[PDB]
Amino acid sequence: SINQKLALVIKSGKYTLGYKSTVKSLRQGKSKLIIIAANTPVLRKSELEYYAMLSKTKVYYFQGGNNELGTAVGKLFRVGVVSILEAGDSDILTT
RNA sequence: AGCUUAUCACCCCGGAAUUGGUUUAUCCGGAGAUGGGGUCUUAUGGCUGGAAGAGGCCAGCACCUUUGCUGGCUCCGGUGC
Fold this sequence. Notes:
The protein has 95 residues and is an alpha+beta fold.
């Protein structure tokens, strides 16, 4: 269950929301996992994948739109991409 | 004609729930709000050149007359379903 794993990292780990801040984290090497919404434009999705290739960052594709991804991270606004800086008690990186 | 002048739009920094901003009219923001600093269109307005030498309003003089001559002032504001 990705929703339960993603909910746990919010309460303990360090995360980052939004496209502009995610690219900054990948550029600095601080990112460990990126989650992309289903309805993200392909050109933006293609650019994010290219950035993760250069920094050797694992990419996960969320099975839902930006409305659904925002709910999973416990926010009342749409989220297009989520960058995980470091996990806490969750094992999302090892699953 | 020169300088300058803008709602909208756009850029940089930054990263938002204790949701904020905002129109008479409810729309916008992690696809990046509010905020701080910038860029641009010149509708339009301001100052200056054009240009006071013009035009306007008066006063004092010549005189059949071709008809003129000499003087001053022409400034500074307010208001709107």
